[PDB]
Amino acid sequence: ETTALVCDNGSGLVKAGFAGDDAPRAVFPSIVGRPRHQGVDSYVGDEAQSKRGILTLKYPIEHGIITNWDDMEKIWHHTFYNELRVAPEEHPTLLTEAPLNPKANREKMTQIMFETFNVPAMYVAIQAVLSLYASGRTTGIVLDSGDGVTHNVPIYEGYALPHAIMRLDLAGRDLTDYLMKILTERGYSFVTTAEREIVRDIKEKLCYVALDFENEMATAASSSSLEKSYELPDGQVITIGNERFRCPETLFQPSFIGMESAGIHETTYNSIMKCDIDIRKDLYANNVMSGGTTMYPGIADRMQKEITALAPSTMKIKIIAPPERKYSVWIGGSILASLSTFQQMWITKQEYDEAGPSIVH
Ligand SMILES: C/C=C/C(=O)C[C@H]1CC[C@H](C)[C@H](CC(=O)NC[C@H](O)[C@H](C)C(=O)NCCC[C@H]2O[C@@]3(CCC[C@@H](CC[C@H](C)/C=C(\C)[C@H](C)O)O3)CC[C@@H]2C)O1
Ligand SMILES: Nc1ncnc2c1ncn2[C@@H]1O[C@H](COP(=O)(O)OP(=O)(O)OP(=O)(O)O)[C@@H](O)[C@H]1O
Ligand SMILES: [Ca+2]
Ligand SMILES: [Ca+2]
Ligand SMILES: [Ca+2]
Ligand SMILES: [Ca+2]
């Protein structure tokens, strides 16, 4: 066939699909399972998830960086052959990487696409910058927060400013774990692997960011107005009250999970302050949120409040939170891969043959 592919590999989820679609058609867990003793060769994604229990399950991307290459090769095979139902040798493939991904790492991605999958052409794009593009901008500061890592990435005239990038190893998995902890403290039992998945769903369905933590805690202590009932698959019902906003509060106050790090408002400010003073105005007016961990209701308003408190009193602050932002990286990749002016930028199989891996730089 013909259509270019966009594969946005994350710590928790693979988002894959065809350039020109408006969302990824294949979204599945970035997990590879190989047989346990009871099992007695490899499974990926939803099937791995459902056959977990007779598999040893591994995440090949850790905090946004590919670390297990053999399992990553399995992910990509499943992506092409099982999910997209394509022959990879027939489709140019755009892949994504984390900010500050080592050069040796982008090179191994490239070596594998060509030497294992025989793709005709490929490209590796930085995730946060693709999210900025998806919002129609070439200058701004992205907060990209997923399952495994959070970054602040200031971007000027199309390209990230690497000296000002901030990485925080606090993201959605840590929030899921903390929700599990605080639900356990309330008296619920969430221990099994099935139960951890339930907690992730609760997080995604019911959590939100309070505008002011203390005020919200006081409302929750004196009223039922913030309570929600959540129905488990087996029919059991639990009440979630202040856990709804205590969970994502950790993004702003990482001390809730024992981390000494600055919160996401502070890392955003600190990143802007590492940039030339003459571009800061434009960064402040173009803070784009990306990634599943930015999906909490209330997060934009809270960011607005917190950045306003840190920034000069006359600064225009604007937080942009696209509704599609679980998929902003992928959408930016799709938009980019379609541009007429991008077609020259693909690395072709023939160019790889002459130069070797470092051509991707
Ligand atoms: C000159 C230096 C280049 C570098 O890559 C240096 C690196 C060194 C390391 C440093 C950390 C930084 C990294 C970086 O930002 N890389 C680029 C990044 O991967 C993005 C996704 C990309 O590949 N982007 C490629 C964009 C290619 C497009 O570039 C343009 C110019 C720049 C802005 C870009 C905007 C494309 C989007 C899809 C369109 C939008 C937002 C319209 C305006 O709505 O178009 C013209 C068309 C062209 C096809 O920059
Ligand atoms: N509505 C929501 N509310 C809160 N969290 C959400 C919501 N939807 C998804 N998430 C969380 O977003 C995360 C997945 O987001 P995303 O796909 O951007 O991450 P990733 O790319 O796999 O990881 P990373 O970018 O950290 O490598 C998960 O932790 C998931 O639970
Ligand atoms: Ca991601
Ligand atoms: Ca307070
Ligand atoms: Ca703290
Ligand atoms: Ca200057």
UniProtKB/Swiss-Prot annotation:
It catalyses: ATP + H2O = ADP + phosphate + H(+). The modification N6-malonyllysine is found at residue 51. Keywords: Acetylation, ADP-ribosylation, ATP-binding, Cytoplasm, Cytoskeleton, Hydrolase, Methylation, Muscle protein, Nucleotide-binding, Oxidation. The keyword Cell cycle does not apply. MICAL1 and MICAL2 produce the (R)-S-oxide form. The (R)-S-oxide form is reverted by MSRB1 and MSRB2, which promotes actin repolymerization. Can be mono-ADP-ribosylated on Arg-167 by SpvB of Salmonella spp. This modification blocks subsequent polymerization and leads to cell death. Its EC number is 3.6.4.-. The modification ADP-ribosylarginine is found at residue 167. Residues 100-113, 348-360 are annotated as: Interaction with alpha-actinin. It comes from the Eukaryota. InterPro entries: Actin, Actin/actin-like_CS, Actin_CS, ATPase_NBD. The modification N6-methyllysine is found at residue 74. GO terms for biological process: actin filament bundle assembly; actin filament polymerization; mesenchyme migration; positive regulation of gene expression; skeletal muscle fiber development; skeletal muscle thin filament assembly. The modification Tele-methylhistidine is found at residue 63. GO terms for cellular component: actin filament; actin filament bundle; cell body; cytoplasm; filamentous actin; filopodium; lamellipodium; skeletal muscle myofibril. It is an enzyme of class 3 (hydrolase). PROSITE patterns: ACTINS_1, ACTINS_2, ACTINS_ACT_LIKE. One of its GO terms (molecular function) is ATP binding. Pfam families: Actin. It is found in: Cytoplasm, Cytoskeleton. SMART domains: ACTIN. Belongs to the actin family. In vertebrates 3 main groups of actin isoforms, alpha, beta and gamma have been identified. The alpha actins are found in muscle tissues and are a major constituent of the contractile apparatus. The beta and gamma actins coexist in most cell types as components of the cytoskeleton and as mediators of internal cell motility. Polymerization of globular actin (G-actin) leads to a structural filament (F-actin) in the form of a two-stranded helix. Each actin can bind to 4 others. Interacts with alpha-actinin. Identified in a complex composed of ACTA1, COBL, GSN and TMSB4X. Interacts with TTID. Interacts (via its C-terminus) with USP25. This is Actin, alpha skeletal muscle. It comes from Oryctolagus cuniculus.
